[PDB]
Design a protein around this ligand. Structure first.
Ligand SMILES: Nc1nc2ncc(COP(=O)(O)O)nc2c(=O)[nH]1
Ligand SMILES: Nc1nc2ncc(COP(=O)(O)O)nc2c(=O)[nH]1
Length: 513
């Protein structure tokens, strides 16, 4: 047979994420159960008892040979087994082998879960996994409509933070990237924008990481300065260490060379007593799985892969082995030497496979003409979606992923502008797709967006600045606009100055005053 089920999970005791992970491990170990998709991780206000620790919540989609009743027993076994060394595992919905929702109303078991339409912490992660046309079996209304209805009440009690796990550090509490969303109807990120500082460990151009190249002591001092500049106005900073050039047609450092450039420097930052370690997050810009693996060993938090797994087929396997590492899935085409030729987006690669496209949970066939105005962002969204599907198929968890539409990567200067304008569409883009004899639903809602506009050629074209070094002021303006269009993180060169821009844009657009 193989039936389908959606289960809600939650914990508000101790290491909540470890309780969740253990429950998912226990499910997966069953011969009768197959994990298909997991939602983002959300933090929510306790619904019933406000004096308690906030809950960590999500949803998991499984394929199972078990009957509803057999599955419920397993959920109870798991809850008990976890208590042995604190986790709730409920059946939310259960579909038969034909993909139809079943209803059970027995003394012991009620499917769908009787409380689900009351709880944003159920519906939000659930609707990351089910499409806008999925109806509630009892009400016959789309579940997304029931979600919208809850948000429409405008109770801050119903508000969710999304948490993206970061690695544990000794003596430190569990670490996350955090994103709070609010509604007004439109949904908007209202927590501070993350600043990612660029650090190039390449010899490429004297003006940018050029002179201190291969000198770890000098480089570290540069990084201490960056952190001080950023932390003046911000609570956190990400330092993105890059040992490989990603500029169109640039010669590629060897792996051994990239490792030598990046890894000792990450080790040195992480070991520094001159840095406030708790406010400093470490990223490595690499498309190489082995470099990522080495970086993880020396205490990196984020793998920033401009190819989204395209350059190394073992990258996803590395990320999958490290559930507390954060992975940036960036959009590109071809490779570094050919991408310039591939900036053409009229035709849709997976066009034939696409069954249905949705913007803000509405079929775009019914938002007529929007389709014609959003060719580029939907094309980029589908290609990000395809990378995402392959990541999930290779053990990467949705909860680990940030997305980046990849400004400048197989895109012209006019296209980069259009991508900035259309971030709100991207953030609310979803589609169903035929994939290996069965249907798959890709939902970009809640996937935090990183943009890297800094010093890019597209700015220079408009401001007539030939040299990249003189594009910092203009970058300030563009960064403000990126945030205004919904960017959750920005990658920048001029940290001291862009920090001011980010803070102002956050005040203006987010009310963070
Ligand atoms: N935010 C939040 N509040 C809560 N309050 C009670 C229960 C326990 O619910 P059950 O007894 O129906 O499983 N679970 C949650 C939860 O998961 N999240
Ligand atoms: N995630 C992400 N990573 C990147 N790495 C390098 C560059 C090229 O810029 P640089 O050569 O000035 O670092 N741009 C990006 C980007 O836009 N997004």
């Amino acid at each position: 047979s193989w039936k389908r089920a959606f289960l809600a999970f939650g914990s508000n005791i101790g290491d909540r994420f470890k309780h969740i992970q253990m429950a998912l491990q226990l499910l997966s170990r069953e011969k009768t159960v197959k994990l298909r998709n997991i939602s983002s991780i959300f933090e929510s206000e306790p619904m019933y008892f406000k004096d308690q620790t906030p809950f960590m919540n999500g949803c998991v989609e499984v394929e199972t040979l078990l009957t509803p009743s057999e599955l419920l027993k397993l959920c109870k076994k798991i809850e008990y087994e976890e208590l042995q060394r604190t986790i709730d595992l409920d059946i939310v919905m259960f579909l038969n082998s034909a993909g139809e929702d079943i209803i059970v109303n027995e003394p012991d078991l009620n499917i769908p879960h009787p409380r689900m339409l009351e709880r944003t912490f159920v519906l939000e992660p659930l609707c990351e996994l089910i499409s806008p046309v999925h109806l509630h079996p009892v009400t016959a209304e789309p579940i997304v409509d029931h979600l919208k209805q809850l948000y429409d009440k405008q109770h801050d009690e119903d508000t969710l933070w999304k948490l993206v796990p970061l690695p544990y550090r000794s003596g430190v509490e569990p670490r996350f990237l955090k994103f709070k969303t609010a509604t007004k109807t439109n949904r908007i990120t209202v927590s501070p924008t993350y600043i990612m500082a660029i650090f190039n460990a390449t010899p490429d151009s004297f003006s940018d990481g050029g002179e201190h190249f291969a000198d770890i002591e000098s480089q570290l001092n540069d990084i201490i300065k960056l952190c001080k500049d950023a932390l003046y106005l911000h609570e956190s900073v990400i330092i993105d260490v890059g040992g490989c050039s990603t500029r169109p047609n640039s010669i590629q450092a060897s792996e051994e060379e990239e490792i030598r450039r990046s890894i000792p420097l990450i080790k040195a930052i992480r070991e520094s007593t001159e840095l406030p370690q708790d406010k400093v997050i470490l990223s490595i810009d690499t498309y190489r799985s082995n470099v990522a693996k080495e970086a993880i060993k020396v205490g990196v938090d984020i793998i920033n892969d401009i190819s989204g797994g395209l350059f190394d087929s073992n990258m996803f396997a590395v990320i999958a082995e490290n559930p507390e590492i954060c992975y940036i899935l960036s959009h590109t085409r071809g490779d570094i030497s050919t991408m310039n030729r591939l900036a053409h987006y009229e035709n849709f690669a997976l066009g034939d496979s696409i069954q249905q496209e949705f913007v803000h949970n509405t079929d775009i066939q019914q938002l007529d003409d929007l389709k014609d105005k959003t060719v580029l962002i939907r094309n980029v969204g589908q290609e990000i979606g395809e990378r995402y599907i392959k990541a999930i198929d290779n053990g990467v968890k949705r909860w680990q992923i940030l997305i980046d539409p990849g400004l400048g990567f197989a895109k012209t200067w006019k296209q980069n502008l259009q991508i900035i304008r259309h971030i709100p569409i991207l953030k609310n883009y979803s589609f169903t797709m035929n994939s290996n004899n069965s249907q798959v639903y890709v939902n970009l809602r809640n996937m935090p967006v990183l943009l890297g506009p800094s010093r890019k050629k597209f700015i220079g074209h408009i401001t007539k600045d030939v040299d990249a070094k003189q594009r910092d002021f203009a970058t300030g303006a563009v960064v403000a606009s990126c945030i205004g269009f919904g960017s959750d993180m920005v990658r920048v060169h001029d940290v001291k100055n862009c920090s001011k821009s980010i803070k102002l844009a956050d005040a203006i657009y987010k009310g963070l005053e």
